[PDB]
Amino acid sequence: IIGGEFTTIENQPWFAAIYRRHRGGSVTYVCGGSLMSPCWVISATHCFIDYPKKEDYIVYLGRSRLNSNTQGEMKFEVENLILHKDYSADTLAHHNDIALLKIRSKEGRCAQPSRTIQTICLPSMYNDPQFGTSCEITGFGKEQSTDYLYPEQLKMTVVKLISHRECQQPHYYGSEVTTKMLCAADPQWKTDSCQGDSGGPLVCSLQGRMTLTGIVSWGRGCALKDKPGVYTRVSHFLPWIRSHT
Ligand SMILES: N=C(N)c1ccc2cccc(Nc3ncccn3)c2c1
């Protein structure tokens, strides 16, 4: 997250920190994710497509720092890693960038909701917020595009939704962005999601309820002028989410 501010997990309790274990024992951060139900985390297929072995992943709920066991956190392994069968990646644009991870503790249980661990509701069919709406994003992604390490403390910021008509303009993304994707950015281009933030939640308050409107997916640069963040539009995928869960 470029700009924004440091935060803790009690402020974004549906946030899942997804890590990968390597031969030799080192563990590294992969992407964020969102808890939609006690047993299911939704993320982005691009985060796992090149290492599609469910046994490699570690998922934490209730965690605020990248390398510290926050009081109240809980750790899980992945019982089922489901990738959309028509995922694909062009030079910039990623398609059907959506994945589901059924989670389970070592004792065989799903998540236990608490003060620092909670689900985030899915959106309804044909009803996303209008362009101009402010939505929040969260992640352990880079703080500056030229950084090579991630911040140790979780961060969050606020950005505004951009219409499909505007995002398809030539200086923005042209016909590369489709109706199955949603754009969002800062009008002053000083804050945004960045690498390391993929798979994380784009949460919008609509009709009074917080909903998982998007999943961090892609973008040219980070907080770069005329290049918004692009997010998987969850409402299009309700038939696929219900079928696979
Ligand atoms: N602009 C986004 N919101 C956004 C969202 C998701 C992204 C994921 C990976 C890489 C990016 N781009 C990137 N460019 C330069 C240095 C590091 N990352 C991204 C950008």
- Domain count of the fold of the chain: 2
86: domain CATH number?
Answer: 2.40.10.10
Distance, CA of 231 to CA of 133 (rounded, Å): 15
Closest C-alpha to 48, from 70, 69, 20: 20
Distance, CA of 185 to CA of 162 (rounded, Å): 7
What is the sign, positive or negative, of the torsion defined by CA atoms of 9, 181, 167, 144? positive
| Strand partners of residue 219 | none
How was this entry determined? X-ray
Q: Are residues 124 and 231 in the same domain?
A: yes
Q: Are residues 76 and 138 in the same domain?
A: no
Q: Are 136 and 155 in contact (CB under 8 A)?
A: no
Q: How far is CA 141 from CA 27, 155, 166, 197, in A?
A: 16, 8, 26, 4
Distance, CA of 106 to CA of 115 (rounded, Å): 22
Q: Are 96 and 107 in contact (CB under 8 A)?
A: no
Other beta carbons within 10 angstroms of residue 20's beta carbon come to 17
**40-43 and 209-218: which strand pairing?**
unpaired
Report CA(196)–ligand 1 centroid distance (Å). Answer: 8
In this structure, what are the phi and psi dihedrals at residue 58, rounded to the nearest 5 degrees?
A: -125, 130
CA 176 from chain centre, in angstroms, equals 21
**C-alpha triplet 12, 40, 62: angle, nearest 5°:** 30
Q: Are 61 and 111 in contact (CB under 8 A)?
A: yes
Q: Helices (DSSP H) in the chain: which residue ranges?
A: 164-167, 238-244
Q: Are residues 126 and 222 in the same domain?
A: yes
Q: Are residues 158 and 77 in the same domain?
A: no
Q: Are residues 111 and 180 in the same domain?
A: no
Q: Are residues 35 and 112 in the same domain?
A: yes
| Strand partners of residue 5 | 156
Q: Are 203 and 177 in contact (CB under 8 A)?
A: no
Coil, helix or strand at residue 169: coil
The CB of 195 under 6 Å from ligand 1? The reply is yes
The CB of 200 under 6 Å from ligand 1? The reply is no
Report CA(198)–ligand 1 centroid distance (Å). Answer: 8
Q: Are residues 98 and 154 in the same domain?
A: no
Closest C-alpha to 137, from 113, 118, 120: 120
Q: Are residues 210 and 125 in the same domain?
A: yes
Closest C-alpha to 216, from 34, 18, 29: 34
Q: Are residues 138 and 199 in the same domain?
A: yes
Cβ-proximal residues to 105 (8 Å cutoff; 6+ apart), any chain: 74, 75, 76, 77
**C-alpha triplet 210, 17, 90: angle, nearest 5°:** 85
The CB of 150 under 6 Å from ligand 1? The reply is no
**DSSP letter at 122?**
P
Q: Are residues 55 and 152 in the same domain?
A: no
Report CA(226)–ligand 1 centroid distance (Å). Answer: 14
Using the structure block, give the residue that is written with the tokens 């219900």: 242
Q: Which residue's CA is the closest to the ligand 1 atom numbered 6?
A: 218
Torsion angle of C-alpha atoms 163, 224, 2, 233, degrees rounded to 10: 30
Which amino acid makes up residue 232? T
Distance, CA of 29 to CA of 37 (rounded, Å): 23
Distance, CA of 164 to CA of 162 (rounded, Å): 7
Q: Are residues 19 and 32 in the same domain?
A: yes
The CB of 196 under 6 Å from ligand 1? The reply is no
Q: Are residues 8 and 72 in the same domain?
A: no
Q: Which residue's CA is the closest to the ligand 1 atom numbered 3?
A: 229
Check residue 140 and give left, alpha or beta (phi > 0: left; psi -120 to 50: alpha): alpha
* N- to C-terminal Cα separation, the chain: 30
- For a mutational test of ligand 1's pocket, the pick from 162, 222, 224, i.e. the residue with the most ligand atoms closer than 8 A to its C-beta, is 222
198 among known catalytic residues: yes
Radius of gyration of the chain (CA): 17
Residue 49 structural domain: 13-119+236-245
Q: Which residue's CA is the closest to the ligand 1 atom numbered 9?
A: 195
Distance, CA of 214 to CA of 137 (rounded, Å): 9
Buried b (16+ CB within 10 A) or exposed e, 46-56: bbbeeeeeeeb
Distance, CA of 171 to CA of 227 (rounded, Å): 8
97 among known catalytic residues: yes
Secondary structure E strands in the chain: 5-6, 15-21, 27-37, 40-43, 57-61, 74-83, 88-89, 94-95, 99-104, 134-139, 155-162, 181-185, 201-206, 209-218, 229-233
Q: Which residue's CA is the closest to the ligand 1 atom numbered 8?
A: 195
DSSP letters for 14-67 = TEEEEEEE-TTS-EEEEEEEEEEETTEEEE-GGGTTTS--GGGEEEEES--BTT
The CB of 145 under 6 Å from ligand 1? The reply is yes
Q: Are 121 and 209 in contact (CB under 8 A)?
A: yes
